[PDB]
Write a protein that binds this ligand. Structure first.
Ligand SMILES: [Mg+2]
Ligand SMILES: [Mg+2]
Ligand SMILES: [Mg+2]
Ligand SMILES: [Mg+2]
Lengths: 362, 362
C-alpha cells in the first residue's frame, strides 16, 4: 500500500543552551534533548515529528521508540492516525499511562500528521481546526536563578523584541524575593502588559495562597502550576481562596488527567503539550475537552509546533519558550504585530535544519 | 563514607515463558523482561533490586537507569533511602509521574532496601512492618486464550499444587464465553475455594456491570480492573450497581493515583506493585494509605518479593503470578499449608541465580 509505513528513523540530539536556564523544581539546564522521528512510507513520502526534554529521558524515549514501538508500526497504514494512536496507547500500556511512553507516542504521532498535511496539501493550523493562523504570544523566561538586574534586562529584551506579554519563574526559598521580583517587573513593564507567573509546582497549597494574595495587586493574568499537578483538589483549595486565575497542563500526559483538571482543579487556563500528551492527536483530544469547558487553550514549549495548534483554536496563549528549538528549524518563530504566525506550508510547519544539528547528534 | 554508593550495575534479561500467556488488553506474551540493578557501596556491600515487564520497556527502563538516574546516585549515601527516593521523583519528574520512570526508581529503591536489610541483619518482612511472615496466596493464571479444557486442567494443577484460591482472566469478545468459563470453574473447584476474576481493563462500565450481575451467583471474591484504571468514577459507577467487590492497583504508579482510588474508586481490595510504584519505599507509602482506609493490601506479580510485603501488613492476598521470576532466584516461592512464606534471610529475600539467567542477558 502506498501509505504503508516502510521505515521509521529516530535520532537523538543534545543541544547546548547558550546560557543556563533555571527553575525551582527542574533545577538547572545546560542543554536540552531533541528526539526526531522520521517516517517513510512505501511510495517514498516522509514525515518528521519530534519531542524534547530539558536534558533527561532522551536515551530512554529513543530506546522506547526503537525497541518497543517502531518495530510494531512497520507495515501499518500511516493514513490511520487515530487507529495507530490507539494501537500505541494499549501497546505500551503496562509501561505507559504517561511518562516516557507519551513522549515516544508524540514523536510518532506528529510524524504522521506531517505526512497527512503533506498528503492533503494542508498546513497544520488548517487540519487542527482552522479558526485562525495567528495567536497571542508571551515570553516564558526560565529565569529563577537570575539576579533581579539580569531579569529586568532580559524582560526588556522581550518587550523590545516585539512581544507584549511575559512570564517569569517563581519559587525562590525566600518568598519575599519572589514578591519583590514580581513587583519589580510590574513597575518595569507598566500597566499595559500581560504578566504571568510560573511556580513549577514548587509550592504548598498554603504557600501558593500566601503568595497569590501577596502579588495580586500587580494584575497577574495567571498563576501556573502553583503546587503538585497531581493534587487537583489542592488547586481547587488554592483557587477558592485567591483571585489570580490558575493554569496547568504541561505535565499532564493523558486525556484522563485533563478530565481531572477540568472536573476538579478549577483552572482558568489549560496547557496541553503536544510533545508529551500524544502528539497532535492527543493534543486535539485535550483541546476539545478544554474547549467544552470554555477554558482558553494554551501551550508551553515548542513554539514552532504549537503556534499552529493555538491559532487553530484561537482562544489561548502561545508560550515562546526559552529552548530555542525553532532556531534549528528552517523557520524560527515569526512574530508580526505582537502575534505569533503559523506557516501555510503543508505539513506540521516545522522542517529541521539537519545540517545545523548534525553536530549535536548522539 | 562506608555506605556511599560506589557503583551501580544494571542488566537486562529476556526470559522465555515455557508457554504463551494471554490477556484481553496486554495481548499475548512469549517472554518477559527482567531488569536487575546491583548497587555497590564503598565498603563493598552489595544490594540488588529489580523490575519486570511482560516484554516491552526493558531497553527503555534500562536506558533510564544508565543515562538519567545512576550517574546521579554515585556518591550519594545509600542509607538515606527516603531522601534518594525523593531525589529521583523530582530528578525525572518532567519525564516521570509514572511510566518508565517508576519502574526504574523501583529497581533502584529495592536495591537500597536489600542493602539496608543486610546492613541491619533484618528480613524484608520485618523492616516492612513485621505483622506476620506468611500470607494468603492465590494463583493468577494469565489464561484468556486457553480452551476451557486447558483452563480447567490448569486450575486443577493449582489446587493440587497446594493452593486454595484462583484467579482467571476474563475479557473475551463474547461475554457469554466469560460467563460460561466462570461457571465452569466454580463447578470444578466447589464452594470452598476463593475465586477471583480479572478483566484487565478490557470492559466498559456498562459491560462490567452486565458481567458482574451475571456471575455474582458463583461467589466471586473480587473483580479486578473491570474498566480503565484512570476512570476512577467509572469504578464507583460499577461498584454502586454490583455486588462483587472491585480490585485495582497494579497499574497505578504514583501515590497520588492511590489517593484517587481510595477517595473515588470505591474499591474492596487494592493492589500496589512494588516493581512499578517506586520500589519498597513507594509500596509502603501506598500500603499505609490503603490501610488508613481499612482496605486489604494485596499485590500482583513478583511473588518472591511481595510475599514479604503482604505478610508484613497481614491483611491481603498475594498473587502467585505466571511469570516464574522466583524460579530464577535461589528460593522459588515457598508454600506451606496454603500460605506463601517469606524468607528470614536478611535483605529483600531474593537472590538471583546469575548462572541460570546469564544465558538470557541482553
Ligand atoms: Mg510551568
Ligand atoms: Mg512543555
Ligand atoms: Mg489485573
Ligand atoms: Mg504487577
Amino acid at each position: 500500500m502506498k501509505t504503508t509505513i516502510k521505515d521509521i528513523k529516530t535520532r537523538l540530539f543534545k543541544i547546548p543552551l547558550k546560557e543556563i536556564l533555571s527553575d525551582a523544581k527542574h533545577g538547572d539546564h545546560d542543554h536540552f534533548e531533541l528526539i526526531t522521528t522520521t517516517v517513510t512510507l512505501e511510495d517514498g513520502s516522509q514525515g518528521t515529528g519530534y519531542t524534547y526534554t530539558g536534558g533527561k529521558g532522551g536515551y530512554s524515549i529513543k530506546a522506547m521508540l526503537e525497541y518497543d514501538i517502531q518495530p510494531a508500526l512497520i507495515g501499518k497504514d500511516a493514513t490511520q492516525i487515530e487507529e495507530i494512536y490507539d494501537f500505541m496507547e494499549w501497546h505500551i500500556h503496562y509501561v505507559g499511562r504517561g511518562g516516557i511512553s507519551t513522549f515516544a507516542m508524540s514523536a510518532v504521532d506528529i510524524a504522521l500528521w506531517d505526512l497527512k498535511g503533506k498528503r492533503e496539501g494542508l498546513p497544520l493550523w488548517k487540519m487542527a481546526g482552522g479558526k485562525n493562523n495567528t495567536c497571542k504570544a508571551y515570553c516564558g523566561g526560565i529565569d529563577l536563578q537570575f539576579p533581579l538586574e539580569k531579569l529586568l534586562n532580559n524582560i526588556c529584551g522581550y518587550l523590545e523584541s516585539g512581544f507584549n506579554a511575559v512570564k517569569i519563574k517563581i519559587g525562590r526559598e525566600n518568598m519575599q524575593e519572589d514578591i519583590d521580583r514580581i513587583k519589580a517587573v510590574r513597575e518595569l513593564i507598566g500597566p499595559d502588559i500581560t504578566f504571568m507567573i510560573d511556580a513549577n509546582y514548587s509550592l504548598t497549597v498554603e504557600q501558593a495562597i500566601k503568595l497569590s494574595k501577596a502579588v495580586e495587586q500587580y494584575d497577574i493574568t495567571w498563576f501556573e502550576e502553583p503546587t503538585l499537578p497531581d493534587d487537583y483538589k489542592g488547586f481547587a483549595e488554592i483557587a477558592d481562596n485567591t483571585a489570580i486565575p490558575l493554569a496547568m497542563g504541561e505535565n499532564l500526559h493523558t486525556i484522563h488527567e485533563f478530565g481531572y483538571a477540568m472536573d476538579q482543579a478549577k483552572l482558568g487556563y489549560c496547557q496541553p503539550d503536544a510533545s508529551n500528551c500524544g502528539g497532535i492527536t492527543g493534543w486535539l483530544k485535550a483541546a476539545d475537552l478544554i474547549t467544552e469547558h470554555n477554558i482558553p487553550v494554551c501551550t508551553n514549549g515548542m513554539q514552532e509546533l504549537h503556534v499552529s495548534l493555538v491559532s487553530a483554536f484561537d482562544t489561548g496563549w502561545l508560550e515562546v519558550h526559552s529552548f530555542p528549538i525553532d532556531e534549528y528549524t528552517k523557520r524560527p518563530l515569526v512574530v508580526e504585530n505582537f502575534r505569533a504566525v503559523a506557516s501555510n506550508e503543508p505539513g506540521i510547519g516545522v522542517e529541521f535544519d539537519w545540517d545545523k544539528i548534525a553536530q549535536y547528534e548522539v
